[PDB]
Amino acid sequence: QFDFRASMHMLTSNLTFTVYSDLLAFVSADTVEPINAVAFDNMRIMNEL
Amino acid sequence: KKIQYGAVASGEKQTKAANSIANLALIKTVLSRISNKYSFATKIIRVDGDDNYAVLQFNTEVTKQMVQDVSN
Numbered sequence: 001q002f003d004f005r006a007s008m009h010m011l012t013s014n015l016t017f018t019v020y021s022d023l024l025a026f027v028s029a030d031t032v033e034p035i036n037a038v039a040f041d042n043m044r045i046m047n048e049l
Numbered sequence: 050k051k052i053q054y055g056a057v058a059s060g061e062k063q064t065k066a067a068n069s070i071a072n073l074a075l076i077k078t079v080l081s082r083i084s085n086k087y088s089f090a091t092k093i094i095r096v097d098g099d100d101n102y103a104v105l106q107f108n109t110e111v112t113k114q115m116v117q118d119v120s121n
Contacts, residue, residue, distance in 0.1 A: 028109035 069096045076101055083119060 031037075039045050057068065073096045080091060080103065087107070094103040 025110065030108050 065098050068098045072096045072099075072101050076103055080105075087115070087119070 035046070037045060057071075058064065073094065076094055076096070080094075083089070089105040089107050092104050092106050095101065
């Protein structure tokens, strides 16, 4: 049997958020000049001439 | 008829390399104005007389609006 009062509820939610799927598009990124590129040992790679 | 034409064309020993030079200077001169609105590193320009293409690399990823605005 349909009880109007007892069937009523209050549903909560957040107000006005925005969902961003991609997450790295906001990142801009650049490389040092690859001649002066360095490894884990803090010592240059491609240096012998 | 004889028409005033104080400019360049072929029929000369000079035309190919000189046109390549002038287009190189032109594109180098133009390309120092896109820098007022974009950050890029010019990797390559190529000129063979009356044609030209320049590749350029950015600090970020490319969009449709940046290509359009660069073209304009």
